[PDB]
Paper text:
The Neuronal Calcium Sensor 1 (NCS-1) is a high-affinity Ca2+-binding protein predominantly expressed in neurons. NCS-1 is a highly conserved protein that regulates synaptogenesis, synaptic transmission and is critical for learning and memory. The interaction between NCS-1 and Ric8a regulates synapse number and probability of neurotransmitter release, thus constituting a pharmacological target for synaptopathies. NCS-1 contains a C-terminal dynamic helix (called H10) that works as a built-in competitive inhibitor and inserts into the crevice to prevent Ric8a binding.
The asymmetric unit (AU) contained two hNCS-1 molecules with an RMSD for all atoms of 1.28 Å. The feature-enhanced and the 2Fo − Fc electron density maps, together with different map calculations allowed the unambiguous modelling of 3b bound to the hydrophobic crevice of one of the two independent hNCS-1 molecules of the AU, while the second hNCS-1 molecule only showed a PEG molecule at the 3b equivalent position. The indole group of 3b is stabilized with π-π interactions with W30 and F85, weak water-mediated H-bonds with D37, and hydrophobic interactions with L89 and I51. Interestingly, the electron density map showed that the NCS-1 bound 3b molecule only displays the E geometry, the QM-predicted and most stable isomer. Furthermore, T92 side chain, that shows double conformations in the absence of 3b, fixes its conformation in the presence of 3b through a H-bond with a water molecule, which permit to establish hydrophobic contacts with the 2-hydroxy-3-nitrophenyl ring. Moreover, 3b does not form strong H-bonds with T92 and Y52 or contact the helix H10, as inhibitors do. Therefore, our data suggest that 3b stabilizes the NCS-1/Ric8a complex keeping the helix H10 out of the crevice, and promoting the entrance and recognition of Ric8a.
Numbering used by the authors: 3 to 189
The structure:
Amino acid sequence: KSNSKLKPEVVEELTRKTYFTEKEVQQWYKGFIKDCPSGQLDAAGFQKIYKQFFPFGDPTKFATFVFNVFDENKDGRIEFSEFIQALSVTSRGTLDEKLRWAFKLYDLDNDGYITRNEMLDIVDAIYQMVGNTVELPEEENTPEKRVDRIFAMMDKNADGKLTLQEFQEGSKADPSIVQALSLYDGL
Ligand SMILES: O=C(Cc1c[nH]c2ccccc12)N/N=C/c1ccc([N+](=O)[O-])c(O)c1
Ligand SMILES: [Ca+2]
Ligand SMILES: [Ca+2]
Ligand SMILES: [Ca+2]
Ligand code: NA
C-alpha cells in the first residue's frame, strides 16, 4: 500500500461525505500521496500549487486565504480528508453549497458577517494574484470599486456587513456569479 491505499472504513467515510465514487476517492488519494508524501500539505506547498497556476502575479495572499478554508481543523496542515471534502464542494457542489463555502472564505474571522474590509482583503488578493498582465475596465479596475459594487448589490440593510442570507441572495441575483458557481468538474 505504502499508504497509497486508504483503510476501507476511511474510503467508505470519504465516499459518503463527497460527490466522489470510491474509485475517484482512491485515485485522488494516490495523487495526493505522490505530490505530498507525508500526507499533510503545508501553507508553503499550497502556495506552490497556486504559484504554477498563476505565475504572473503574487498569489501568496489569496492562496493563504484558501488554504485556511481547506484547513477545517486549523492545525496548519491540509490532510487528505480536508483536501477531498474541499475539492468535492468547490468542484461538484450545488450552488447553495458552493455559496456557503464561498462565504466561509470571505468571512475571515468566522463571525457570521462579511464586512467591507474582509471583502476588500480577499478582493485585493485576487487582483494581486492575476496581476496587471491585462488592463481591466475602468469601473472595476481597483479592488475598492469591485467591493463597492458588491455591497451596493447585496447589502440590503446598508450596515456595511453581509449576512449569509444577503450574500446568498445577492449572489443569486447576479448572472455572472450564478454562472461561476454552477460548474461541475469545471463545466
Ligand atoms: O489543490 C487544489 C485543487 C486541485 C485541482 N486539481 C488538482 C491537482 C492536484 C492537486 C490539487 C488539485 N487547489 N484548488 C483549490 C481550490 C480552492 C478554492 C477554489 N475557489 O476559490 O473557487 C477553487 O476553484 C479551487
Ligand atoms: Ca488541517
Ligand atoms: Ca466576519
Ligand atoms: Ca447587511
Ligand atoms: Na460520494
